[PDB]
Amino acid sequence: EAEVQIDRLITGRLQSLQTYVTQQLIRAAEIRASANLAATKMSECVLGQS
Amino acid sequence: KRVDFCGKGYHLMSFPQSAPHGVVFLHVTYVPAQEKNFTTAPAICHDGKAHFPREGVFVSNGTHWFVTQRNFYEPQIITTDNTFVSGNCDVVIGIVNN
Amino acid sequence: FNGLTVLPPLLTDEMIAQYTSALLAGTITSGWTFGAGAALQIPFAMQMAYRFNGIGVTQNVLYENQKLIANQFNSAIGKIQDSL
Numbered sequence: 001e002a003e004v005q006i007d008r009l010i011t012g013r014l015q016s017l018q019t020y021v022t023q024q025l026i027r028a029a030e031i032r033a034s035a036n037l038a039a040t041k042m043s044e045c046v047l048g049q050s
Numbered sequence: 051k052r053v054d055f056c057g058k059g060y061h062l063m064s065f066p067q068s069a070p071h072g073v074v075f076l077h078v079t080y081v082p083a084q085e086k087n088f089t090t091a092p093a094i095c096h097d098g099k100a101h102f103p104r105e106g107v108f109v110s111n112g113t114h115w116f117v118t119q120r121n122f123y124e125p126q127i128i129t130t131d132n133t134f135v136s137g138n139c140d141v142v143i144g145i146v147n148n
Numbered sequence: 149f150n151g152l153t154v155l156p157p158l159l160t161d162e163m164i165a166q167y168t169s170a171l172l173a174g175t176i177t178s179g180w181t182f183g184a185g186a187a188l189q190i191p192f193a194m195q196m197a198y199r200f201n202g203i204g205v206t207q208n209v210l211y212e213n214q215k216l217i218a219n220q221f222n223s224a225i226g227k228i229q230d231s232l
């Protein structure tokens with residue numbers, strides 16, 4: 001029956017970990033978009049005149 | 051006109067190409083080289099009046115003064131057709147008589 | 149730890165500051181030509197003259213009102229430093 005209990009714990013922690021990973025992916029995509037915008041601004045407004 | 055958007059340097063033109071799951075650009079760009087050094091000045095005071103360049107910049111190799119464009123070296127004699135006058139010169143810093 | 153860990157970044161802060169100082173010294177000394185080929189020296193007067201000529205105002209204004217502009221810029225940078 002310890003195997004039953006361990007199955008319960010494993011499935012619960014698996015859903016928790018999956019949720020964390022998905023949130024991390026979304027936030028990383030947003031930060032990448034912002035970084036691309038910042039790179040464009042630095043390449044355009046600094047090395048020249050806008 | 052936006053620098054360093056497409057290419058590296060001044061931009062001229064481009065050609066597209068195909069690919070399996072993408073596109074390929076061949077930007078044709080313009081890059082200067084073989085630089086030289088000269089002595090500059092912001093304006094010239096003549097007859098009490100300050101003269102400024104219409105476009106370009108004043109340069110000199112030591113003995114004579116010329117006006118040239120900003121991205122290439124071509125010398126022209128200073129005349130009253132490529133320069134414009136604006137008042138008298140007493141506050142400009144760097145004037146040189148000629 | 150307790151299961152998780154935080155890895156260090158590849159670039160340390162000193163290198164970042166070095167990059168920023170390089171860019172800033174380059175844009176002070178050469179203008180914008182250092183973004184295309186080799187950097188060329190240019191005095192800081194006839195760089196602001198070009199920048200005004202870009203936005204429509206002729207270059208007479210800068211060479212006839214230099215001290216006022218210098219004071220304006222110094223006061224502005226002092227104010228932003230104090231506000232921060």
Ligand SMILES: *[C@@H]1O[C@H](CO)[C@@H](O[C@@H]2O[C@H](CO)[C@@H](O)[C@H](O)[C@H]2NC(C)=O)[C@H](O)[C@H]1NC(C)=O
Nearest residue numbers: 088109110111112113114115116125126127128
């Ligand atoms: C700066 O360039 C000018 C333009 O060529 C030089 O002036 C000429 O010099 C040659 C020398 O062989 C003379 O034959 C010409 O009569 C000059 N032209 C004029 C309009 O004076 C000048 O010598 C150069 N200065 C230096 C230091 O090299």
Ligand SMILES: *[C@@H]1O[C@H](CO)[C@@H](O[C@@H]2O[C@H](CO)[C@@H](O)[C@H](O)[C@H]2NC(C)=O)[C@H](O)[C@H]1NC(C)=O
Nearest residue numbers: 094095096097098139142143144145146147148
């Ligand atoms: C450019 O040359 C002119 C002509 O000599 C200079 O004008 C005079 O220069 C003398 C020399 O210092 C002064 O004493 C006079 O007051 C100036 N004006 C007049 C009406 O004679 C002018 O100063 C020279 N420019 C520079 C920057 O030296």
